[model samples]
Target: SMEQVAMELRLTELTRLLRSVLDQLQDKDPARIFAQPVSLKEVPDYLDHIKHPMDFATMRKRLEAQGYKNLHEFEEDFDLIIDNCMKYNARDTVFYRAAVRLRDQGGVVLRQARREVDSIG
Candidate 1:
């Protein structure tokens, strides 16, 4: 529990999603996915992931796509997406923190994604 409050906050939305998706996931073993930590890198593997968030957030201009309009928007929603995925799968606490780290460092991830994009181009 990273400062208990964080853990509380982490599961807040996840609990809601889990409650909704629980019965539907009965036959599925959540432990297989949620309990296991997924490897989220410090940097995004694609530049689109970066430009989509940072550009709209800092520059006020959309560089990637209309879909990615802001860093917080992407971060918040992305976090929720990962949270829901883990909640449905019942991932362990460490995995939860890993997800949080990605959410917390959205800017850094944007940079990583940008680097990835640059390398390919």
Candidate 2:
């Protein structure tokens, strides 16, 4: 016999969501800036303003540790990545515009919802 599931359905679903969402998010970085954490030396003022720093890299670590309890948690951090950038950079800047593309133009939110329903079904 073969093992059908190595973990519960919730973990399996959440893990799959993390992998897919994170991979998709990386592509929407606009540049390489969104993929990784902000280098303090690159923007020394970054940490000063944003208390809750987030990025795909940080999200990956949490996913590995099974930190996400549900899609809401995962989505919160996902939005936070874009939200943080938008709040940090001015409206006319590239980062803000790209964040807009990711949050507004991005269909990943609905994708997650639809997939979860599909997977759950």
Candidate 3:
């Protein structure tokens, strides 16, 4: 089970790195979208998937109709909308692209952590 062990170790680090970024976000999702940990295996699926939607204009319109007034409000709706879509296994490329961009911003931090860990060898 050495492979499994290594994968788990990788996920631990990745989750930690991801959480740091999530913590810094304005929304701080109560839906636990970024609350739970993630695995390294899921990273590419999220960051690379083209099937996920990015429909920002529609999202903006919906939120505007709901009287959303700020970044935190937008983020909360953003988190909720995406969480619901994911629950049903729906895919929107635009949403996914936006997610990837957010994740990619944190990817730099993950990579730096990875390098630091590797150098500890």
Candidate 4:
């Protein structure tokens, strides 16, 4: 019972951390995070190459205004995931192909669900 409780607490924390990051990356109005290309090749462009008039602090403030406590939390969480993925053998070509297929299938499911939501109106 103690083990089960500890496991549940761990899962709950993980879920909150996941939601915090997903909201930042995907919930912004103009650029839904999921719509952004997640390819490694796109990382440089997102992180540094873009000539946005906006400063990091200003952008982070805006993110907080939209209910995120701090965008840095998401960034840190993402870096941890990426670091672990790199440290492990989880991102091979076959893994990439499978991930792509899974995402494509998820998109189809989301689209249908979105349509259903609209039809409810």
Top of the candidates by lDDT: 2
Q: How many backbone clashes does candidate 1 have?
A: 8
Error of 4 at 68 (Å): 21
Which runs in model 4 stand beyond 4 Å of their true positions?
27-29, 33-121
Clash pairs detected, candidate 3: 52-92, 52-93, 53-92, 53-93, 53-94, 53-95, 54-93, 54-94, 54-95
Query: How many clashing residue pairs are found in candidate 4?
Result: 2
Worst 10 residues of 3 by lDDT: 26-35
Best by TM-score: 2
For residue 88, model 3's alpha carbon misses the true position, in angstroms, by: 7.3
- For 1-121, candidate 2 gives per-residue lDDT tens digits of 1354544666867777767767776777657677778888888988889988888888999988878877678788988898899889999998888888888655655476657746874
Q: What is the C-alpha RMSD of each candidate to the true structure, in Å?
A: 19.1, 3.6, 15.9, 14.9
TM-score of candidate 4 versus the correct structure, residues matched by position: 0.27
Error of 1 at 98 (Å): 7.9
Question: Any residue pairs clashing in model 4, and if so which?
Answer: 25-33, 26-33
Superposed Cα deviation of residue 69, candidate 2 (Å):
1.2
| lDDT tens digits, residue span 21-116, model 1 | 322222232333322223336434433332222211222122122333333454454444355544433456654554455445444544554454
